[PDB]
Paper text:
Type-A γ-aminobutyric acid receptors (GABAARs) are the principal mediators of rapid inhibitory synaptic transmission in the vertebrate nervous system. One such protein, GABAAR-associated protein (GABARAP), is an isoform of the mammalian autophagy-related protein 8 (Atg8) family protein, a ubiquitin-like protein required for the formation of autophagosomal membranes. Instead, a previously unrecognized fragment of the TM3–TM4 intracellular loop of γ2-GABAAR (γ2-GIM) specifically binds to GABARAP/GABARAPL1, but not other Atg8 family members. Thus, specific binding between GABARAP/GABARAPL1 and the GABAAR γ2 subunit increases the extent of GABA MCD possibly by promoting accumulation of the GABAARs at the cell surface.
In the complex, GABARAPL1 adopts a typical architecture for an Atg8 ortholog protein, consisting of 2 N-terminal α-helices and a ubiquitin-like core. The clearly defined region of the γ2-GIM in our complex structure contains 13 highly conserved residues (EEYGYECLDGKDC; 401–413). A detailed structural analysis of the inter-molecular interface between GABARAPL1 and γ2-GIM in our complex structure revealed a classic GIM-dependent binding mode. In particular, the aromatic side chain of γ2-GIM Y405 is deeply inserted into a hydrophobic pocket of GABARAPL1 formed by the hydrophobic side chains of I21, P30, L50, and F104 residues (together with the aliphatic side chain of K48). The hydrophobic side chain of γ2-GIM L408 occupies another hydrophobic pocket of GABARAPL1 that is positioned in the β2/α3 groove and formed by the Y49, V51, F60, and I64 residues of GABARAPL1. In addition, hydrogen bonds were observed between GABARAPL1 E17 and γ2-GIM Y405 and between GABARAPL1 K66 and γ2-GIM D412. Our structure also clearly indicated that the GABARAPL1–γ2-GIM complex is further stabilized by two charge–charge interactions: one is located at the N-terminal area of GIM–GABARAPL1 interface and is mediated by the negatively charged E402 of γ2-GIM and the positively charged K24 of GABARAPL1; the other is formed between the negatively charged γ2-GIM residue E406 and the positively charged R67 residue of GABARAPL1. In agreement with our structural observations, K24E, L50A, and R67E from GABARAPL1 all abolished any interaction with γ2-GIM.
Author numbering: -4 to 117
Write the structure that this text describes.
Amino acid sequence: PGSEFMKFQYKEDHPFEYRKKEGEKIRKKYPDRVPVIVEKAPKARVPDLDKRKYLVPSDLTVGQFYFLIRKRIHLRPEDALFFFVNNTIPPTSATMGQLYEDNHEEDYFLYVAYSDESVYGK
């Protein structure tokens, strides 16, 4: 009850220095995009996406990114879905670039989890 640490398989599978090289290479090669890892939250009976690493246009809004991911995920129209970045639901009107700037980790990746619940891990 309360918060829970967001675990990402991408961080389990790749050492920090590997992730930081990739994050920096991406930011150098595609300055108008932000690298984003998208994985499921625990206890949610939802699909994995076909892939977890995304290069997102910086000016795409969070609302638009939600549209694309919700369409990509294999879910029924009645299924609820919420995004979490650093344990909080991001603003719909934010750009992915702003969200990235404020929330990316030391490896220069932004981490997004999704769940059918409105609190991460519940």
